[PDB]
Symmetry: D3
Subunit: 288 residues, 6 copies
């Protein structure tokens, strides 16, 4: 089947963060701070002459308590972030979840028509991890387990499973035409997955937090904060490099402001960026 | 290492059901119906000279929509059922869940001080199965998986996990002094577990639905309705027989009125039975 | 590439409680009914090349099994296969869905045929028979042997020594256009079903994984089986996907409804004969 | 200690055989032939003061075509072999099968009251191997598979399974009081097992054909003919040496005339040997 | 029936950023500090008698590794062992927690010592070193080799050939009262920790699974490591359980706090020395 | 679309008991015979692509091993490869069937070649070497080291760090038309054989899983091996299936019968040269 997809990376928030957090405890230690985007990626396309899908890789978090747990700024609603590219949250039929951290699957219920795809190992891993954490007597002992995980997202996932809106992927699978989910077990998280997007202009990768920063995969240096196996990430980087033949601009990192320096980018009134990574044959640009 | 436990099996409801359902196709086919008890079991004890635990194996379902999906009668609140043996739901500190069928974990939020114990395979099995079933285009194609399973219990399970009130068992484990949980993978359900209870009068077994009826384990004949592997149940029957040295009255089946005929039993006003299976050193009977 | 013509032939009939085949809930206490005992003949293979004459299963012999259960109208392979223009000597390969007596019993009646069975089926029954002899009484073994003849374990071993039995381990395209599919712990330890590719699309020989169309149409496994009910659910879905929900393309094991869904002749006696596919020039063997 | 066993190794036949077969292709190539005993081992005992079991480790082959496929001589019936130590074949309640080669299980039906214990992997291994062999067009291509295996023993085993005479062991198991079966997967054969026998004078090992000759385990040099994994045999030798704390005479090899030099031995009229390896407490010697 | 004398000796020091050892987030952009390089001497065994001289880890040689990091105060083993009454050649056994340069580099300075290391540790590094060489530039290889010397792969092989090294595969009580604990994919592919059963309770040589006491106390894996963050969390719980949450009975890899909570006395260059347990019938040391 | 020229080059000869190579049963007490020591030259790859020059195995050096067995006629890689128009410097790839001394001992004579080994072979020998040193005497270690030199373990680790050795894990097409097939616990822990696809059909470099044509023709594994005899049986079946029972298409490890099945000529000292295949557009010798 021939597939083609338009791809936009949309900032919906910003975080000021220690560099070693994203870039590595070695190379980026004691290197000050910087602003990094909170991003989700819109994909529109599919089989040519077939159903057109409106897909989000990840969907941001909500305007809730998480805004106080880190140095966030410039948060924007899905109505506004997607409106600037000519869509609405109602139009989104699928959310592909790289991992169940709060900033990639929180707020999925703002897309009432979307089905959620999660790796089974991600869901089961977090169920066990959350349950195990309650053997510690204080919350200080639980802090690391919950640094990026909202137990309420466990409840929402179960609610979606029973509702029929959450679907499990187990391993690798072409879930939409030209989008292949790749399980990276115990990489960034228990069941992090990345996505291979095949377009007429070649492959693109939505890496999730497996690749926080381009420097992670270019320097082969896993981040200072992650909740998996650093050597597994090494293995995944090599898989990703092979898919895109080291055309590093084709990989979408999770939280790297460097992405705006590498693609046709314009900014919204508040500053949040929009990137036009690719346009399928016959589509028009969204720059004002 | 010296454990001792008092054991009461208490009926909270009754169901009229075709016999082959519980007893088996072929041998009990076209045998009409009979009343069968809906049961949970109270265990009080632990290490002699130690903390006396108050534990439930299973806790029944709520008087909700489930009362109409089967021929139930005489449903009773846990306050009424445990009161007859001298306890209240607030006393229950542990609920041992044999499996996640609605009638064994439905009403657990009625015991606000209790921790829930479930096999990881039971929880993960149902998460996968519920999700897989929503790939069917019609609701009729989904009936069989949900005949005994309430997706609302999946949600309550997830809520208790994050609350810290639900704990996973993975395999065999002595979770309380003298009570060891036994994983029976893919027997009655994905992660059914049974419980071995060690007292001064020897072992007792809480079997759950692996053994619906004594005849399941006496005739080695699995039921006409189950959601796991029939030959796995046979193997579990053999383990149970070995633990109990073939003294069958020492096994507590899930839904067999025959239990009231094998132990010291009396009736409540509405009819629900209270079987006293064992009394630990120093306890007086509650007839 | 490949094409095959297909006939399903009865060789006996069985009167059985409906809950046996259809489910303990929905078909309980529904009386009894007549069900065909069937094996399926396939003739063909690759288009320009060796024509194979194949049986899926081969029925049982007229021995003590006629007094077991309640059979009637039993017929010899010489009679059943002659009506379609063949003799028992023509069959070069018999595909065994599982080692229950009525699907592999009479295999020595086809002297030129190689028998194909899943390694897990043979190993499972070897273990199960041996394990059952841990029970001291014959009554405790009844369920293991409800459908299994220990003499067929010996005949199977005799055939292994003869080179007449071949093991399949998992999925395999055995003959041209016929893929065996292992369904581990489905009806039995190593049940397998067969995907048959013709010019008119695919056909499925389901064995007893699907006793009745109602099993797979309602997604409701039978009341009697010796495997895992949820595994059967998974297989039902695999089969539906292969056949694009064109259910008449699935050959159930023991369902009179197949005579209502296909060109079906009838024999001098009651046992039926049903055409399912005729690949170009296979003159219909319909009178 | 609460268990005790008397132990006799009894030769029932003799075989003239090339030395490299039993001792190894390195040291014993082109080294001629020698006479080697065909042996099964009688164990009498159990719980001290409780049931006196009568046990055979292996039971030899029958007087059939096998007598011509090798240089056999002096085959003797179980009535005569066991008669010399004061027992009859009807006394044997248990036959422990090291492996299903013809000379270790061929004759089990001459012991009408005995249950056979066989490793599940041994039975399934031979079932597969026999069935696979019939893909070869000539009987010569099957010859190695059948050098020590009789397909008729497959049928007899299936018959014993159906009768309730055959019991499967899967892995390690204390089968009788003081006798533990040890699975040695893929050693001499698919499911070879050896037996540790606890006596008041310490442990004895019935090695089956894992140890043909003392030299295999003393020199750590597996034989030239076997149907398993040579390095697996190396690993089992180490387990055996450790159990007997390097008392090599406590190990009963399958086919070594050297055993008559290491134990109190006398001979029958035809030359077949009797070795009294151990006499449990209270037991009297059987030497004439 | 089993007793052990236990000494933790600092053979060197490093000035390192805090998030490296303590964790990103709670120690991000928090500056740096001096941290010790230690190996742990245990001598004793079955109270019956046979006394073994065992080292947990054995430092790194004084070579190019001294310039790769803010090292100082590197001392010889004969120097450091002498201050507690021993000579390298006395060591019977070197228990290797993992194959990073600074726990395995100088094992040849102990000609009598058998080396015990996990099969997965050795096998994982063989795999990794080989995998890295499909990277064309040296910058891409940097992280794999931050703590690993390819020359230690060649020594290990030479040790295998010589009979100096033996592979553990799983848990195994390697010497009377010392249980080796496989922690697959913790700090490294096959890191392991050791559970020393002394008459005065239990002791844990943590290796680099626990860089700092605060990794286990704050349940917070470090910012640099080369295995599985959640696996470390689960080993933290296995350790906490073995010592009943008495954290001092765990010896971290590179925490100067260990000097603070155990009898310590500086040496000439300052490299500390702490005695954690002297087996009754054993003589102390300054 | 692949094509390869194939030469089997004897670089040495060994006088050995027949049962060693042929079997403890059939060839017992059968005396000895001369057997070739062989490595195979492969030149080709994808048609229209980078033509590779590859060695399957590379022999051992003229060192202590020349005295550990009845060897004769040892020749250098410079001489043996010189006769077919190449030098050791041309070989960029050596595919190693197993780590026995006579198949990897001399790989450093090929300074530009990458070495490919099964991971299970390397870890297998690493473990076995360590386990062997638990025995207190050297006679108890002899069988483990009959064909294995611990110096090759050290040379292997050095190449690992140097970047010259690569691990294969299971089956893999390493070069165009060459598939490595792991045969776990066959001749050794991680023995591998190679399927070579040419325009004239498939050829197999069997290593020592097949010492002699009679192993696979008689389905009778050898009297000396360090793996699992029934695994070799199953591997024999895979090989026979690939070549559709054309046994001359299988390259055995040590069988002089090979010179009788192909265009063969001899060197001055006696060592044989076998031209098994010439890819489209090639001239003989
Ligand atoms: Zn994240
Ligand atoms: Zn993120
Ligand atoms: Zn139930
Ligand atoms: Zn129930
Ligand atoms: Zn059936
Ligand atoms: Zn049937
Ligand atoms: Zn044998
Ligand atoms: Zn033998
Ligand atoms: Zn370190
Ligand atoms: Zn380290
Ligand atoms: Zn070799
Ligand atoms: Zn060789």
């Amino acid at each position: 089947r021939d597939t083609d997809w338009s791809i936009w990376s949309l900032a919906y928030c910003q975080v000021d963060m220690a560099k070693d957090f994203f870039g590595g405890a070695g190379i980026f230690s004691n290197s000050g701070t910087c602003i990094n985007p909170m991003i989700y990626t819109l994909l529109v396309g599919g089989e040519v002459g077939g159903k057109q899908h409106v897909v989000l890789v990840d969907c941001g978090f909500q305007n809730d308590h998480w805004l106080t747990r880190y140095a966030f700024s410039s948060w924007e609603d899905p109505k506004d972030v997607l409106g600037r590219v000519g869509f609405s949250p109602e139009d989104v039929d699928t959310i592909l979840v790289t991992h169940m951290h709060f900033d990639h699957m929180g707020n999925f219920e703002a897309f009432p028509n979307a089905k959620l795809y999660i790796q089974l190992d991600e869901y089961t891993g977090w169920s066990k991890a959350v349950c195990s954490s309650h053997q510690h007597e204080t919350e200080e002992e639980k802090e690391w387990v919950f640094t990026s995980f909202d137990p309420a997202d466990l409840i929402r996932a179960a609610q979606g499973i029973s509702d029929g809106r959450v679907k499990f992927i187990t391993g690798d699978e072409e879930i939409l035409p030209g989008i292949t989910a790749r399980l990276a077990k115990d990489s960034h998280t228990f069941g992090s997955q990345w996505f291979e997007v095949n377009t007429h202009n070649g492959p693109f990768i939505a890496a999730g937090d497996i690749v926080y920063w381009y420097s992670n995969i270019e320097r082969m240096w896993p981040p200072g904060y992650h909740q998996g196996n650093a050597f597994n990430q090494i293995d995944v980087y090599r898989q990703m490099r092979s898919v895109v033949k080291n055309k590093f601009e084709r990989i979408i990192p999770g939280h790297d402001a460097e992405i705006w320096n590498r693609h046709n980018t314009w900014t919204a009134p508040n500053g949040n960026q929009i990137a036009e990574l690719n346009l399928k044959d016959g589509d028009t640009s969204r720059r004002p």
